[PDB]
Amino acid sequence: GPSLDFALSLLRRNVRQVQTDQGHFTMLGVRDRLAVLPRHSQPGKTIWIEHKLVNVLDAVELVDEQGVNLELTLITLDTNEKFRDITKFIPENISTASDATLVINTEHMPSMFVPVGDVVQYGFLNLSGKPTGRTMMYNFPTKAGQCGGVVTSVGKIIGIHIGGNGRQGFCAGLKRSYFAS
Numbered sequence: 661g662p663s664l665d666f667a668l669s670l671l672r673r674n675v676r677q678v679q680t681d682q683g684h685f686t687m688l689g690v691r692d693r694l695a696v697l698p699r700h701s702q703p704g705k706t707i708w709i710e711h712k713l714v715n716v717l718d719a720v721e722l723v724d725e726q727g728v729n730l731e732l733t734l735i736t737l738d739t740n741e742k743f744r745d746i747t748k749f750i751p752e753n754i755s756t757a758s759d760a761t762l763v764i765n766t767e768h769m770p771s772m773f774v775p776v777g778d779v780v781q782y783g784f785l786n787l788s789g790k791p792t793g794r795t796m797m798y799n800f801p802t803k804a805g806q807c808g809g810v811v812t813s814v815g816k817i818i819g820i821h822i823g824g825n826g827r828q829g830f831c832a833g834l835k836r837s838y839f840a841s
């Protein structure tokens with residue numbers, strides 16, 4: 661329902677195709693020159709965005725208050741573009757959902773939407789040997805190439821896709837405070 665239309669608007673204004681040396685990812689533009697990627701994309705000093713090479717001014721790998729990996733990297737892009745500020749749609753606390761849509765946009769998987777259904781609290785995740793906190797899980801067979809995908813519910817941006825085991829998928833939860841100045 662209304663979830664899907666919200667997801668479509670977010671795609672056009674805030675979701676971009678990127679490529680690093682690690683491959684193709686979806687990127688969420690958060691506000692102005694600030695964006696977020698899965699940590700394992702390992703963005704360097706230059707990144708491909710929508711067929712242009714773009715300088716990266718700064719990058720920070722996010723951890724929680726105890727130091728646990730959140731599997732998210734915040735980057736500031738050297739770009740003319742200024743993302744519409746979508747932080748008001750990110751909840752203050754990690755939020756589950758009943759009818760979520762995953763928004764993917766890479767060169768190999770352009771502009772696609774996947775109804776993943778319920779997104780439930782999971783927490784600690786061992787992701788190919790890398791400990792990760794604050795994850796959520798969906799019972800949907802997500803696949804390689806979908807990392808960075810944005811998990812949304814009606815009027816809420818709740819996660820970034822980071823992994824899966826063939827039958828289930830997992831996202832890093834989003835909190836508004838990650839993006840505070």
Ligand SMILES: CCOC(=O)CC[C@H](C[C@@H]1CCNC1=O)NC(=O)[C@@H](CC(=O)[C@@H](NC(=O)c1cc(C)on1)C(C)C)Cc1ccc(F)cc1
Nearest residue numbers: 700786787788790802803804805806807822823824825826
């Ligand atoms: C290399 C290409 O990379 C990509 O395409 C990025 C996106 C894919 C999407 C997966 C691809 C598959 N189904 C999915 O949804 N993500 C991964 O592959 C990650 C690994 C897993 O998902 C692992 N899963 C878990 O550990 C796992 C644990 C439980 C529990 O559930 N899944 C692998 C075993 C698949 C990549 C990763 C490697 C090292 C790290 F430090 C941290 C992350």
